[PDB]
Amino acid sequence: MEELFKKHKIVAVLRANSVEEAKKKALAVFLGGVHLIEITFTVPDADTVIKELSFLKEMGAIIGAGTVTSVEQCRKAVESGAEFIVSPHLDEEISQFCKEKGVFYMPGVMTPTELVKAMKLGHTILKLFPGEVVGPQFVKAMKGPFPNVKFVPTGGVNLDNVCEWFKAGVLAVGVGSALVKGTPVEVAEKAKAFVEKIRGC
Amino acid sequence: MEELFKKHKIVAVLRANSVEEAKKKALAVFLGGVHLIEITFTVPDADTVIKELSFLKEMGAIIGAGTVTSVEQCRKAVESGAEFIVSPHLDEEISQFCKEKGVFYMPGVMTPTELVKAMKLGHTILKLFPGEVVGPQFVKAMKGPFPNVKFVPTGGVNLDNVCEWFKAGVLAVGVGSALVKGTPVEVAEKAKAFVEKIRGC
Amino acid sequence: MEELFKKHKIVAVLRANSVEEAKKKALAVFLGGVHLIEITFTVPDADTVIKELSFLKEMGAIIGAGTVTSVEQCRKAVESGAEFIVSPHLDEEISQFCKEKGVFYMPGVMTPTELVKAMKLGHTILKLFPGEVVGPQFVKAMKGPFPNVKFVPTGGVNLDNVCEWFKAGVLAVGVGSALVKGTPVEVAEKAKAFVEKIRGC
Amino acid sequence: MEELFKKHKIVAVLRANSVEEAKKKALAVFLGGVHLIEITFTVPDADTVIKELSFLKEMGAIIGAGTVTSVEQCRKAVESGAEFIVSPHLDEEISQFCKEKGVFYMPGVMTPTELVKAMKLGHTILKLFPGEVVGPQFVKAMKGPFPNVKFVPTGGVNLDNVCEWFKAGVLAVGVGSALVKGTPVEVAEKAKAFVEKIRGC
């Protein structure tokens, strides 16, 4: 899995108001070149969307679940075929469950104390969230004491600063509203703009 | 079926060099607002593409087959779930087969003699091909002797003249290379431009 | 209680160097239109001030306790008639005690991990502190994964930015030194300026 | 120990790529007037460097260990004669060990919740890290609810802002790359510039 992040260098963090909106947006994103799509559990019947998008997996997409905040949600996400589980926070109970099921799990951290607590569970890739608050500087600071930890920031990434996150040394960037807000066509165009900007830095 | 043509007012006539290209282009077209997609039998394993795109049917797409030139091809297209069969020409053998299977069939004509030969088989919607040769004038001429026949031209339709075909009085327009040539993103953008231009005329 | 926050939209976080200073400042704040006053346990004999200000409760004030950092302090605050308990941090022991006594309790969080740990205790209103560090952006980021959590930032609120906190979507703002620093008259005037600015946004 | 921090008002947080580099840099720093040197466990055989620099202790240096992230590392640091242990985070297990051995221990915090959790262990001096993220504002905010806690920020300190950290009211500043990056001569010169700038504010 880690290798997939390194290759693609972008995750779409997809939020929608309905099942229908979610599926159409997932397609708009895929076509642009963003092969990693995270279906958030803030989408009604998110579980359904994860299963019904299984036809994209065959085309080279890797579909995961986001905003997973309990072991009960996590189990539904894995059973429904999620390729990876992402949480907003660090959770010991979910981390244990995923390990037994062998599903890659990316917890969230914001502080050195949360960071170390994650590392003791064996995690070396961490979600940095909210990114816009801690900023690119956080990643540069962490490189010092923890050379072997890599971050995927979520929140605040846009076409003016996406290259600064990469110059600091992140693994990949997650993009929310800056990507997926708009019509299905506008979204596809924005997605292209991100991939070109990343491959260019 | 006729009602679907009247509502959507556009068909994509999809040609590709591979199975993979075809599926990605079908998606680029769908998202833009073009709900009628014709998978031509000039695409290698076109039959496969028709079946594997069945997940779009659930989203409101109607997927058919194009350039069907024998009863043997037609049967494979129908068995694979094609929603309609389109030929480049008028063929008595295919017309008979489709009627028994109850699948809408749109033959091709170019001349008044081919036109009348079709009408005697009970067809009232005809494919006009190649459109760029006969031009918009053909449709205006046919309105006279055959008020009850409607055309769907294919070939030569573009963003400079698509409204002239509608002002003459066609049922819908089929678009080939002018739509589907380009990258998956460029295609989606072109598709939007067509739908907006038609709804505007 | 929640309803009271929604109506008033401001809390004074009162710090003083003596019992006498605290009571006079509480009055300066009340008269201006700020009906929610938090008496911090950094005021000597804070407990006394909470009891002796009980005559304001009859006039429509709701007087609570702030900077409550142990179960021992909390019990004294509740026994002395505090209408709500506010802590600088999330504390399981205090949260349990207040629940049994039925006194509204607003814990502090700074990180998504602290946030979720609070939600599991049943808290939906959280103190965001220090606000000036995390900024207005934190609230916008949290709206995504936790649509059902609302914040009351403390620290950094002033007459130049108080409307940005509201546009992000906070429940209410707590104001410290920017309000309560100055003479009893100057404080009353500042309080008026805040209420007018909030009602205006 | 606290008294030593108050007197010197600067710590060098030393990172190096080899044993040899570390020893030469420790000397460059010492001569400039920075008597507190923290040998990070990111230096290969950091333990060796701590022991072999014991000749500086006689000259008035106080040599400690940094980036100590397990009880196993901590024990080696103390046995090797470290004068103080610094961690990147708050750790209950290390805090207990050091207390029994009587070695001053400075944990890391970033949030009010981490802060209070430290205070319950009896710590009144805290490492604030990463400083550049939380900024000088964090210290001003904490002065309110916790008048009796003092910070030593690490990260982001430089010759343009070192006086702002002191005006907020920190105990001392830790300096990383802004000091120790460069040749042994350049480092000595930078060290002088820091001491003069601090004594001047």
Q: Nearest-CA neighbor of C142 among D133, A113, A69, D130?
A: A69
The Cα–Cα gap between C147 and C154 comes to 20
DSSP 8-class letter at A80? T
Query: What residues of A are in contact with residue C145 (Cβ under 8 Å)?
Result: 40, 42, 67, 69, 88
Q: Look at chain A and count its residues.
A: 201
Contact criterion met (CB below 8 Å) for B53 and B35 = no
List Cα–Cα distances, B199 to A100, B31, B36, in angstroms: 55, 16, 16
A133: nearest CB among C115, C116, C135: C135
Contact criterion met (CB below 8 Å) for C34 and C195 = yes
Query: What residues of A are in contact with residue B191 (Cβ under 8 Å)?
Result: 185
The Cα–Cα gap between B197 and D100 comes to 80
CA-based radius of gyration for chain D:
16
User: Which value in Å is the resolution of this experimental model?
Assistant: 3.5
Which residue type, as a one-letter code, is found at position B59?
M
Strand arrangement, sheet containing A11-14: A105-106, A85-86, A62-66, A36-40, A11-14, A174-175
Contact criterion met (CB below 8 Å) for C50 and C81 = yes
Q: Residue B163, SS3?
A: helix
Count of beta carbons in the 10 Å neighbourhood of residue B2? 11
Bond before C130 cis per omega within 30 degrees: yes
D137: nearest CB among C69, C114, C130: C130
Give the pairing of strands A174-175 and D36-40.
unpaired
Q: At what angle do helices A184-199 and A19-32 cross, to 10 degrees?
A: 40
Question: Across A56-149, where does the E strand assignment appear?
Answer: 62-66, 85-86, 105-106, 108-109, 125-128
Q: Cβ neighbours of residue B160 under 8 Å, at least 6 residues apart?
A: none
D116: nearest CB among C15, C69, C156: C69
Q: Nearest-CA neighbor of D4 among D62, D59, D50?
A: D62
A184 → chain B, closest CA residue: B31
List Cα–Cα distances, D169 to A20, A74, D117, in angstroms: 55, 46, 22
Q: Cβ neighbours of residue A187 under 8 Å, at least 6 residues apart?
A: A25, A28, A29, A32, A179, A180, A181
The residues facing B34 across adjacent strands are none
Note if B92 is an active site residue: no
Question: Across A48-180, where does the E strand assignment appear?
Answer: 62-66, 85-86, 105-106, 108-109, 125-128, 150-153, 174-175
Count of beta carbons in the 10 Å neighbourhood of residue D136? 20
Are C88 and D112 an interchain contact pair (Cβ–Cβ within 8 Å)?
yes
The Cα–Cα gap between A5 and A26 comes to 18
DSSP line for C45-74: THHHHHHHTHHHHTTT-EEEEES--SHHHH
**Range list of H helices, B102-148:** 112-119, 131-134, 136-143
Please give the helix or strand (H or E) that residue C21 lies within, else none. helix C19-32
Give the A-side interface with C, CB within 8 Å: 15, 40, 42, 67, 69, 88-91, 108-111, 114, 129-130, 132-133, 155-156, 176-177
The rounded Cα B171 to chain-centroid distance in angstroms is 11
Query: What residues of C are in contact with residue D144 (Cβ under 8 Å)?
Result: 15, 42, 67, 155, 176-177
The tokens describing D16, both together, are 């190096």
Which residue type, as a one-letter code, is found at position A178?
A
The Cα–Cα gap between C178 and C172 comes to 16
Contact criterion met (CB below 8 Å) for A49 and A19 = yes
Contact criterion met (CB below 8 Å) for A117 and A146 = no
Q: Residue A63, SS3?
A: strand
Q: Which residue has the tokens 């997939």?
A: A4
Q: Which of D9, D23, D25, D38 is catalytic?
A: D38
The tokens describing A45, both together, are 């019947």
- From C69's Cα to the closest Cα of chain A, the distance in A is 21
Contact criterion met (CB below 8 Å) for A169 and A144 = no
Chains D and B touch (3+ CB pairs under 8 A): no
Query: What residues of D are in contact with residue A144 (Cβ under 8 Å)?
Result: 15, 42, 67, 155, 176-177
Q: Which of B23, B127, B150, B190 is catalytic?
A: B127
Bond before C107 cis per omega within 30 degrees: no
Are C144 and A15 an interchain contact pair (Cβ–Cβ within 8 Å)?
yes
The Cα–Cα gap between C165 and C155 comes to 12
Q: Look at chain B and count its residues.
A: 201
Q: Which residue has the tokens 């900077």?
A: C67
DSSP line for C115-128: HHHHHTTT--EEEE
Give the pairing of strands C85-86 and C105-106.
parallel
D136 → chain C, closest CA residue: C133
Q: Look at chain D and count its residues.
A: 201
Strand arrangement, sheet containing D36-40: D105-106, D85-86, D62-66, D36-40, D11-14, D174-175
Q: Nearest-CA neighbor of D49 among D87, D19, D14, D91?
A: D19
Question: Across chain A, where does the E strand assignment appear?
Answer: 11-14, 36-40, 62-66, 85-86, 105-106, 108-109, 125-128, 150-153, 174-175
- From A29's Cα to the closest Cα of chain B, the distance in A is 10
Which residue type, as a one-letter code, is found at position C88?
P
Bond before D136 cis per omega within 30 degrees: no
A111 → chain D, closest CA residue: D110
Strand arrangement, sheet containing C108-109: C108-109, C125-128, C150-153
Q: How many CB pairs (< 8 A) connect A and B? A: 43
Please give the helix or strand (H or E) that residue D193 lies within, else none. helix D184-199
The Cα–Cα gap between D184 and C12 comes to 54
Chain A partners (3+ C-beta pairs within 8 A): B, C, D
Chain B partners (3+ C-beta pairs within 8 A): A
Can you say whether the dihedral through the CA atoms of D61, D65, D71, D73 is positive or negative?
negative
Are B59 and A30 an interchain contact pair (Cβ–Cβ within 8 Å)?
no
DSSP 8-class letter at B145? T
C112: nearest CB among A40, A88, A177: A88
The Cα–Cα gap between A29 and B47 comes to 27
Q: Nearest-CA neighbor of A172 among A74, A38, A56?
A: A38
A185: nearest CB among B24, B27, B188: B188
Please give the helix or strand (H or E) that residue C201 lies within, else none. none
Residue A13: exposed, middle, or buried by beta-carbon count in 10 A (0-12, 13-18, 19+)?
buried
**Solved using:** cryo-EM
Question: Helix (H) and strand (E) counts for chain A?
Answer: 12, 9
What's the start-to-end Cα distance of chain D, in Å? 22
Which residue type, as a one-letter code, is found at position C180?
V
The tokens describing C67, both together, are 């900077």
Q: Residue D58, SS3?
A: coil
Chains C and B touch (3+ CB pairs under 8 A): no
Query: What residues of C are in contact with residue A91 (Cβ under 8 Å)?
Result: 116
List Cα–Cα distances, D177 to A141, B151, D12, in angstroms: 10, 75, 9
Are A185 and B184 an interchain contact pair (Cβ–Cβ within 8 Å)?
no
List Cα–Cα distances, D141 to C156, D110, D151, D193, in angstroms: 9, 13, 12, 29
D109 → chain A, closest CA residue: A113
Give the B-side interface with A, CB within 8 Å: 23-24, 27-28, 30-32, 52, 55, 59, 184-185, 188-189, 191-192
The residues facing A152 across adjacent strands are A127
The Cα–Cα gap between A108 and B84 comes to 50
Name the residue ranges covered by the structural domains of chain B: 1-201
Contact criterion met (CB below 8 Å) for A106 and A84 = yes
Active-site residue set of C:
38, 127
